[PDB]
């Protein structure tokens, strides 16, 4: 009927994410700024979450 | 209160009881898995790997999360027992073809920009 | 096709002579047409049975 | 109008060429390098300039619906020829 | 009803230029049919047609025995037909290039090339973009 | 086709039908591979005068669904989702195959 | 450091490791492991092949798109060697034939070809050169194999002063000739051993360890002019080694002593095969010879490698030789053989 | 309004609204909201505890019979406290009508399996568990159905990456297929396509 | 409106019963099947003599990609990147910069033929008829790397197949 758990919610063990991408990542919670090229404000309504940028290199073939 | 409903276990003790049952089942199954799959690891290697996977998430203090983990463990045990899993699936627990990533600061600084 | 350039692209002969047609072709082939919010389940009689999409 | 790098490698229209020390040239050994010989810039420079008796002329690249979108070019500037944004053809208003 | 069949067979034998030509076309094309010569290729291919046959067998080609650089008496492939005869042969049009020649351009290839895979002329991909970041070159003058 | 008449008779007797009347292979009744150019008419909204877009905007006439019985907020005959489906008829063309 | 040769990525399949290797003899037993380890890190591997291209097909999946390039070469042609190492910053030499051939005797394989490779690599500006010789390489050795190995090692050192030289000892693996040779002997009923193999000590080394040692020697800046001895952790008598090999395969072991002249005569008769020989007099000499001990040379532990004992990676080689009855037998029910350690 | 706009049907809207009110009155303990979309589709929002009673009533009642289950899926909205949204799509052969039943769930609360009510649900619930991680209480045989053996994580979730966390390749040293961390040759390119101007004024939300 | 498919019963008169017994004991329908197969034995096979004969195609057929030019020789592509934005498989990669004479042209134009799905959306989105899907389909390669086309390969394809691509576009541009 009711167990009345008294623990902080934590589902890191059920999501299947490697600990490298849990203990090290740094999300960023923000409302995106308006694109200065335009005057429309319809892209500044909802909050967004994104992760920190990691390395990108040039693949030897095709660049 | 919190208006939460359990999956299987009311408290931590039942969850623990189920964890021990799952551990016994896996401990029993390891030798048969080694024979059937024709693995090149010893039974001690399989059993201490099972122990390490059990201890990997020994910090959980929520009975519902523990029940879900036990359910997933039983699913994997059932896949192992019925031979649905192949040799590659069993050996994926050992990461035999991955270079050991360093954990100290100096080697991480030497290799790249990723902390 | 539906004679509504905000959903279906205009003809190639009008995209190259009309400004509105070129703008609509551009915005249809880069961004696409917006669909009003909602949910539907439409099912047809496919050869193998009832094929539907939610 | 292809050139040749000091290493004997052809230079493309873009102009990318491997540096003497670039190991990526090994992919061309026992094989060839794909280079298009019809350079667009020279071919469009070879075209003559059209003389028209209007301050504004239109271009669609030739072929009507088989060309580019029709644009209008202003020819009021005397020391410069109007150039089509799409086709690259040049036009001028008669002088001298 | 039967002697006529044998006579058509012997006429097919005769129409290829004797027994040697009949054997050549039998061992090269696995077919000894005869048809009207629509036209002959720049590289040596000969194109025939026979409208009495059903759709798909009313247009064929006898490939040349020597392409740009390789001997092609035995190893023929469908990549040797030039684009105009490619369009005619695949039933994309009703008119051969001998009747409706393609438009001429200064940039169009004057010598068709077959599939060059597996040969030293194969296409090797590479990046066409220049360098992104230029580095700092230290001076050659000693500082003390 | 081009088969011998005796072979034609053998085929017709072996199959039970007249194969000559219907042939799977196509010889000369299909359309020509080269066709005259088309004209392709325009459509209903290609007018110049009575063609304001706000009067033919299908996307802008959609509205959020009608909420009936929000929980937060006599006869009463029982009602069905739709009238019962009518019994099908037995194919006057060919009822039994 | 030639920016296009700067390491990038997490060291995976699509990374860049800054290594442009030319693995000579990559279509062999050690070559496949070396190429696999090079391609794991994202290195560029140039594979010079002389065999049928069908025989290099197993190397294709070992690298990403365009990271493995196959070129044809000739051992006696210097221009092909010039072509295949012109763009490499490291050259690995694994060329070697166990049995002498009509067109390539031991001098051609172990002396002339390595010397030519070293000379052309030095003339081409190649920075690193890894050369593989034998642990028992001796100039007074009764085996032409090891005499040629020593002469070629000296010539390579003379032509490429900064060359790294590696001396493994009887590498064992899945495709390894050494483990299989003993297993193959069961067909002849008994196992002919000179002096019952009671006066021959062997120190075999695992193939993965040798490949990892080569890879770590490529990336070690202070291993230019060094010479390494890659040997296993344990030393075994030949009799006990063969007994363990037959016990793992679950085959009846019937050894018997055979005199040196008879064994040599037997080897000579076999040598007449126009194909690859089953055994030769040279193989006879090498297999009944004690492995040299060289404490003055570095080893796998000096490159970070912990040598894998034979008792851990022997079942993966010898399970193929079991019958159906014993095919499913486990690994740790064999009671490992006795080691004469010091 | 004639040629390009879809034609609205008044009769079906009234019928569906009347039946929605009927079902709402019969089951006040579980039904939380009833909607009829303007393309004539009826939706019923219920409480998670009422999955079995509502489905049993809709399958067995004389007036409304929905013997056939057309679909059963889940929708993931991370911004809601109850993350997942279970959708049941039924079809009535007797009355030639369709109904939709919705409920909600989070990562840890289980939902009663509807296998007893519908045979078709046994596979659908397996797929929901496999892709979203929603546990169904009394499922006779609950396990992964579509994903690989020993596959960690649930693919149909907003947080989960498009290309996953591991990728497969064959390694000649170990002579088997091995899984290693994903390292794409070319990264997927993310496009920002939303227009900064409002398209449909009818769905504008209050600015609080 | 419905019809039954297996809802007929056989007549039990002695003539029909004897006919059924004769069918059972003498395999009449089996002989009918043999006769049908023998009938097809004597027809003309529908096999074409590839590679000397090719199956029919249409001007709308989508084959290998190509980059076209204007009659003057200038490339038609202007680096508008519509084809890259519309590609369902993300197979097109484009980079651009002003040319030496100020034209808006590409410096990189790669199409991954192993990611491509040959849907033709790219030649629909292009406003200047620059990228097209030519009629070639026999371009199998022995290595994966040969199927990663760059700008030079596509321009060579256009130069090689223009004589047919222009004719194909002429025969169908009125339907677009
Ligand atoms: C049978 C006994 C021999 C006579 C025979 O085969 O004739 C069958 C001939 C087959 O007719 P068909 O193939 O239906 O007619 C198509 C034309 O003949 C189509 O004529 P075609 O232009 O294809 O003729 C090519 C010609 C030349 O073909 C060849 O030389 C290559 C094939 C040689 C096969 C041997 O075929 C022959 O001369 C060989 C005919 C069969 C010889 C046996 O007609 C009959 O003789 C019927 C006889 C009773 C059969 C029951
Ligand atoms: C993997 O490497 C190796 C091989 O590859 C496959 C070999 O074949 C090989 C040699 C083994 C041979 C293939 C022998 C196989 C067959 C035997 C010779 C049995 C035949 C012996 C007699 C004919 C028995 C008949 C009765 C007699 C009295 C005569 C060796 C040593 C080896 O090492
Ligand atoms: C025990 C009995 C058998 C003994 C061995 C002989 C057996 C019979 C051998 C018969 C050989 C027939 C095959 C050769 C046919 C040639 C046809 C020709 O096409 O081949 C060409 C190549 O010919 C080959 O060079 C011939 C191979 C045979 C060479 C001689 C073999 C002699 C064998 C002797 C065996 C014993 C030797 C002595 C020591 C034992 C390549 O053809 P290809 O391009 O594909 O075909 C094109 C297909 N098209 C039309 C669709 C385009
Ligand atoms: N294997 C062992 O137990 C030990 C090996 N070594 C040394 O390691 C190296 C390789 O070991 P392994 O790979 O097991 O031996 P392999 O015979 O398996 O490797 C043979 C390689 O050498 C090439 N090769 C042989 N002769 C020639 C030639 N005349 N011209 C060109 N290429 C040739 C082969 O090419 P192809 O096959 O196409 O002819 C093949 O790539 C050798 O130098 C060997 O002496 C050292 C100690 C022990
Ligand atoms: S055909 Fe389709 S998938 Fe292929 S490049 Fe063009 S748009 Fe992309
Ligand atoms: S090919 Fe066409 S659509 Fe693509 S970038 Fe060039 S002009 Fe634009
Ligand atoms: Zn123009």
On whether the CB atoms of residues E38 and E49 are closer than 8 A, the answer is yes
- Which residue in chain E is spatially nearest to A62 when comparing CA positions? E127
Residues of chain E positioned with their CB less than 8 A from the CB of G3: 133, 135
Among E32, E72, E74, the mutation site with the greatest number of ligand 3 atoms within 8 A of its Cβ is: E74
On whether the CB atoms of residues G160 and G123 are closer than 8 A, the answer is no
CA angle G272, G274, G277 (to 5 degrees): 65
On whether the CB atoms of residues E35 and E49 are closer than 8 A, the answer is yes
Among G23, G24, G28, G47, the mutation site with the greatest number of ligand 4 atoms within 8 A of its Cβ is: G28
Which resolution in angstroms does this entry have?
2.9
Closest CA to C29 of C10, C3, C1: C10
**Residue from the list C3, C35, C37 with its beta carbon closest to the beta carbon of F43:** C3
Domain residues for the domain of G313 are 1-342
Neighbours, chain G (3 or more CB pairs < 8 A): A, B, D, E, H, I
Residue located nearest, by CA, to atom 19 of ligand 4: G28
Q: Is G95 known to sit in a ligand binding site? A: yes
Residue D8 burial class via C-beta count within 10 angstroms: exposed 0-12, middle 13-18, buried 19 and up: exposed
Q: Please give the structure tokens belonging to residue E135.
A: 């580095």
What region, left, alpha or beta, does residue I79 occupy, with left being phi > 0 and alpha being psi -120 to 50 degrees?
A: left
On whether the CB atoms of residues D8 and D2 are closer than 8 A, the answer is no
Query: Distance from the CA of H65 to the center of ligand 4, in angstroms?
Result: 77
d(CA B42, CA G334): 12
CB contact, 8 Å: H206 with chain A? no
Q: How many CB atoms lie within 10 A of CB H25?
A: 11
CB contact, 8 Å: E74 with chain A? no
Ligand number nearest to the C-alpha of E25:
3
Q: How many CB atoms lie within 10 A of CB G325?
A: 8
**Could you tell me if the CB of G93 is within 6 A of ligand 4?**
no
Closest CA to G52 of G38, G68, G72: G72
- Structure method: cryo-EM
Q: How far is G320 from chain A (nearest CA, A)?
A: 37
G210 to each of G43, G249, G259, H38, how far by Cα in Å?
Answer: 18, 24, 34, 72
Torsion of CA F57, F60, F61, F66, to 10 degrees: 170
CATH code of the domain occupying D41-92: 2.60.260.40
CB contact, 8 Å: E55 with chain A? no
**Could you tell me if the CB of G181 is within 6 A of ligand 2?**
yes
Ligand number nearest to the C-alpha of D69:
7
Neighbours, chain C (3 or more CB pairs < 8 A): D, F, H, I
Q: At what angle do helices G30-40 and G207-218 cross, to 10 degrees?
A: 50
Pairing between strand F66-68 and G68-72? unpaired
What residues contact I82, with CB distance under 8 A and at least 6 apart? Answer: C26, C29, C30, I125, I126, I127
- Provide the b/e sequence for F1-34 (b: ≥16 CB within 10 Å): eeeeeeeeebbeebbeeebeeeeeeeeeeeeebe
Sign of torsion, CA I123 I128 I129 I131?
A: negative
Closest CA to E124 of D27, D12, G53, D16: D27
On whether the CB atoms of residues E62 and E25 are closer than 8 A, the answer is yes
Domain residues for the domain of B78 are 1-115
Q: Inter-chain contact D40–I105, Cβ cutoff 8 Å?
A: yes
Q: Please give the structure tokens belonging to residue I161.
A: 């197949």
CA angle I155, E119, D39 (to 5 degrees): 20
Q: Is I23 known to sit in a ligand binding site? A: no
Q: How far is E129 from chain D (nearest CA, A)?
A: 6
On whether the CB atoms of residues F38 and I175 are closer than 8 A, the answer is yes
Closest CA to G228 of G166, G181, G168, G273: G166
Q: How far is I158 from chain D (nearest CA, A)?
A: 10
B83 to each of B77, B90, D63, H14, how far by Cα in Å?
Answer: 10, 10, 67, 56
- One-letter-per-residue 3-state SS of B29-82: HHHHHHHHHCCCCCHHHHHHHHHHHHHCCCCCCCHHHHHHHHHHHHHHHHHHHC
Query: Distance from the CA of G340 to the center of ligand 7, in angstroms?
Result: 88
Pairing between strand E59-62 and F66-68? unpaired
d(CA E82, CA E96): 12
Q: Please give the structure tokens belonging to residue H177.
A: 């297929």
Instruction: Residue window 60-99, chain B: list those with CB within 8 Å of chain A.
Output: 60-65, 68-69, 72
CA angle G109, G112, G113 (to 5 degrees): 60
d(CA G311, CA G184): 19
DSSP state of D33: -
Tell me how long chain B is. Answer: 115
**Residue from the list A18, A41, A56 with its beta carbon closest to the beta carbon of H187:** A56
Give the H or E element holding residue E59: strand E59-62
Q: Inter-chain contact F88–I1, Cβ cutoff 8 Å?
A: yes
d(CA B71, CA A17): 18
User: Which of A15, A37, A60, A61 is most worth mutating to test chain H (most H CB atoms within 10 A of its CB)?
Assistant: A15
Q: How far is I115 from chain G (nearest CA, A)?
A: 14
The beta strands (E) that lie in G61-189 are given as 68-72, 90-93, 128-132, 164-168, 171-172
The number of folded domains in chain G is 1
On whether the CB atoms of residues F68 and H21 are closer than 8 A, the answer is yes
Q: SS3 helix, strand, coil % of chain E, rounded to 5? A: 25, 10, 65
Q: How many CB atoms lie within 10 A of CB B24?
A: 10
d(CA G68, CA G40): 12
G64 to each of G47, G60, G61, how far by Cα in Å?
Answer: 14, 9, 8
Query: Distance from the CA of D68 to the center of ligand 7, in angstroms?
Result: 7
Q: Please give the structure tokens belonging to residue B70.
A: 């036990």
**Residue from the list F10, F38, F96 with its beta carbon closest to the beta carbon of I175:** F38
d(CA E84, CA E80): 12
**Omega of the bond prior to I51 within 30 degrees of 0, cis?**
yes
On whether the CB atoms of residues H80 and H66 are closer than 8 A, the answer is no
Q: Is G16 helix (H, G, I), strand (E, B) or coil?
A: strand
What region, left, alpha or beta, does residue E135 occupy, with left being phi > 0 and alpha being psi -120 to 50 degrees?
A: beta
Q: How far is I139 from chain G (nearest CA, A)?
A: 19
d(CA G122, CA G162): 10
């Amino acid at each position: 009927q009711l167990i009345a758990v008294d623990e902080k919610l934590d589902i890191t063990t059920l999501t299947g994410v490697p600990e490298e991408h849990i203990k090290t990542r740094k999300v960023r919670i923000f409302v995106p700024a308006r694109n200065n090229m335009q005057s429309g404000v319809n892209n500044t309504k909802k909050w967004k979450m994104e992760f920190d940028t990691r390395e990108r290199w040039e693949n030897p073939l095709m660049g | 209160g919190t208006s939460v409903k359990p999956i299987f276990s009311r408290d931590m003790n039942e969850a623990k009881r189920r964890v021990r049952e799952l551990y016994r089942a896996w401990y029993r199954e390891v030798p048969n898995t080694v024979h059937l799959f024709q693995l090149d690891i010893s039974v001690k290697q399989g059993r201490d790997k099972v122990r390490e996977m059990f201890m990997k998430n020994a910090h959980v203090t929520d009975p519902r999360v523990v029940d879900l983990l036990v359910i997933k463990g039983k699913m994997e045990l059932e896949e192992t027992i019925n031979v649905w899993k192949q040799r590659t699936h069993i050996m994926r627990f050992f990461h035999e073809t991955e270079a050991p990533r360093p954990t100290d600061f100096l080697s991480k600084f030497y290799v790249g920009h990723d902390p | 096709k539906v004679d509504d350039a905000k959903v279906s692209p205009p003809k190639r002969a009008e995209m190259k002579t009309s400004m509105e047609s070129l703008i609509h072709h551009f915005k249809l082939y880069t961004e696409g047409y917006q669909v009003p919010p909602g949910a539907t389940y439409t099912a047809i009689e496919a050869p193998k049975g009832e094929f539907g999409v939610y | 109008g292809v050139r040749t790098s000091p290493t004997g490698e052809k230079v493309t229209h873009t102009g990318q060429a491997y540096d003497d020390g670039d190991y990526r040239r090994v992919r061309f050994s026992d094989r060839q390098k794909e280079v298009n010989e019809n350079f667009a810039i020279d071919l469009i420079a070879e075209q003559p300039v059209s003389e028209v008796g209007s301050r504004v002329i239109s271009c669609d690249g030739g072929g009507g619906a088989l060309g580019h979108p029709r644009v209008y070019i202003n020819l009021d500037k005397e020391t410069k020829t109007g150039t089509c944004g799409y086709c690259g053809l040049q036009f001028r208003q008669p002088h001298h | 009803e039967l002697v006529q069949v044998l006579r058509r067979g012997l006429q097919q034998v005769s129409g290829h230029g004797g027994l040697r030509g009949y054997l050549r076309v039998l061992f090269r094309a696995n077919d000894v049919r005869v048809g009207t010569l629509v036209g002959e290729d720049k590289y040596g291919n000969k194109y025939y047609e026979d409208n009495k046959q059903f759709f798909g067998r009313h247009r064929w080609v006898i490939y040349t025995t020597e392409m740009n650089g390789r001997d092609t008496f035995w190893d023929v492939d469908g990549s040797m037909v030039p684009p105009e005869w490619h369009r005619w042969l695949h039933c994309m049009t009703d008119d051969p290039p001998t009747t409706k020649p393609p438009t001429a351009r200064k940039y169009i290839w004057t010598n068709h090339k077959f599939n060059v895979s597996g040969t030293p002329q194969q296409y090797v991909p590479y990046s066409t973009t220049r360098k992104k970041i230029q580095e700092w070159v230290p001076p050659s003058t000693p500082y003390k | 086709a081009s088969a011998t008449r005796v072979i034609q008779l053998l085929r017709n007797w072996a199959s039970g039908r007249d194969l000559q009347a219907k042939l799977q292979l196509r010889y000369q009744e299909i359309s020509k591979r080269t066709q005259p150019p088309p004209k392709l008419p325009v459509g209903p909204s290609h007018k110049l005068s009575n063609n304001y877009y706000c009067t033919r905007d299908g996307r802008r006439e959609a509205m959020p669904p009608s909420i009936v019985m929000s929980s937060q907020k006599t006869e009463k005959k029982a009602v069905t989702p739709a009238p019962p489906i009518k019994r099908w008829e037995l194919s006057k063309d060919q009822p039994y195959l | 450091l030639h920016h296009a040769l700067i390491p990038h990525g997490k060291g995976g399949r699509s990374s860049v490791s800054g290594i442009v290797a030319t693995v000579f003899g990559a279509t062999g037993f050690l070559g496949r492991y070396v190429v696999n380890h090079l391609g794991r890190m994202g290195s560029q591997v140039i594979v010079p092949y002389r065999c049928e291209p069908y025989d290099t097909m197993h190397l294709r999946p070992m690298g990403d798109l365009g990271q493995i390039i196959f070129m044809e070469w000739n051992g006696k042609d210097k221009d092909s060697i010039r072509k295949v190492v012109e763009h490499s910053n490291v050259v690995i030499n694994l060329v070697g034939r166990e049995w002498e051939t009509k067109n390539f005797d031991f001098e051609d394989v172990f002396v002339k070809i390595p010397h030519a490779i070293a000379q052309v690599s030095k003339e081409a500006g190649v920075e690193k050169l890894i050369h593989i010789s034998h642990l028992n390489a001796d100039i007074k050795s009764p085996s032409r194999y090891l005499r040629s190995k020593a002469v070629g090692e000296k010539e390579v050192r003379a032509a490429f002063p900064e060359a790294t030289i590696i001396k493994p000892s009887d590498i064992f693996g899945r495709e390894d000739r050494f483990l299989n040779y003993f297993a193959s002997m069961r067909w002849f009923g008994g196992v002919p051993l000179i002096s019952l193999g009671k006066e021959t000590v062997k120190q075999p080394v695992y193939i993965v360890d040798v490949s990892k040692g080569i890879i770590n020697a490529i990336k070690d800046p202070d291993a230019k002019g060094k010479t390494f001895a890659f040997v296993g952790p344990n030393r075994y008598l030949l009799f006990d080694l063969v007994q363990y090999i037959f016990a793992v395969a679950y085959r009846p072991f019937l050894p018997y002593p055979l005199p040196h002249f008879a064994y040599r005569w037997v080897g000579r008769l076999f040598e007449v095969s126009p194909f690859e020989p089953w055994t030769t007099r040279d193989k006879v000499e090498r297999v009944h010879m004690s492995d040299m001990t060289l404490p003055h040379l570095p080893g796998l532990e000096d490159l970070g490698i912990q040598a894998t004992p034979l008792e851990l990676k022997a079942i993966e080689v010898l399970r193929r030789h079991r019958t159906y009855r014993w095919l499913t037998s486990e690994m740790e029910d064999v009671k490992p053989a006795k080691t004469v350690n010091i | 309004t004639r040629p390009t706009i879809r034609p609205r049907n008044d009769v079906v809207h009234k019928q569906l609204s009347a039946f929605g009110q009927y079902v709402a009155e019969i089951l006040p303990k579980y039904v939380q909201q009833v909607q009829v979309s303007c393309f004539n589709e009826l939706e019923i929002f219920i409480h998670p505890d009422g999955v079995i009673p509502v489905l049993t009533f809709l399958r067995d009642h004389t007036n409304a019979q929905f013997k056939s289950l057309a679909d059963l899926t889940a929708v993931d909205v991370p911004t809601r406290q109850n993350r997942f949204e279970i959708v049941y799509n039924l079809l009535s052969l007797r009355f030639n009508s369709r109904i939709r039943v919705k409920t909600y769930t989070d990562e840890l609360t289980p939902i009663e399996s509807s296998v007893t009510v519908y045979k078709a649900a046994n596979w659908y619930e397996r797929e929901i568990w496999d892709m979203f991680g929603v546990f169904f209480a009394n499922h006779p045989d609950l396990r992964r159905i579509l994903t690989d053996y020993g596959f960690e994580g649930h693919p149909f979730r907003k947080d989960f990456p498009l290309s996953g966390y591991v990728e497969l390749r064959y390694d000649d040293e170990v002579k088997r297929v091995v899984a290693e961390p994903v390292e794409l040759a070319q990264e997927f390119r993310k496009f920002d396509l939303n227009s900064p101007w409002e398209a449909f004024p009818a769905y504008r939300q209050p600015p609080e | 409106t419905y019809k039954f498919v297996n809802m007929r019963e056989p007549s039990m008169d002695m003539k029909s019963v004897t006919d059924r017994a004769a069918q059972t004991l003498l395999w009449t329908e089996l002989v009918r099947g043999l006769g049908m197969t023998l009938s097809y034995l004597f027809r003309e096979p529908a096999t074409i003599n590839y590679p000397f004969e090719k199956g029919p195609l249409s001007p709308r057929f989508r084959g290998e990609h190509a980059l076209r030019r204007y009659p003057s020789g200038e490339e038609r592509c202007i680096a508008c990147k519509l084809c890259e934005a519309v590609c369902p498989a993300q197979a097109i990669t484009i980079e651009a910069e002003p040319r030496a004479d100020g034209s808006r042209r590409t410096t990189r134009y790669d199409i991954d033929m192993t990611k491509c799905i040959y849907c033709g959306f790219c030649q629909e989105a292009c406003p200047v008829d620059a990228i097209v899907e030519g009629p070639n389909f026999e371009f199998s390669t022995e290595t994966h790397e040969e199927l990663l086309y760059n700008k030079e390969k596509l321009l060579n394809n256009g130069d090689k197949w223009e004589a047919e691509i222009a004719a194909n576009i002429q025969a169908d541009y009125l339907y677009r």
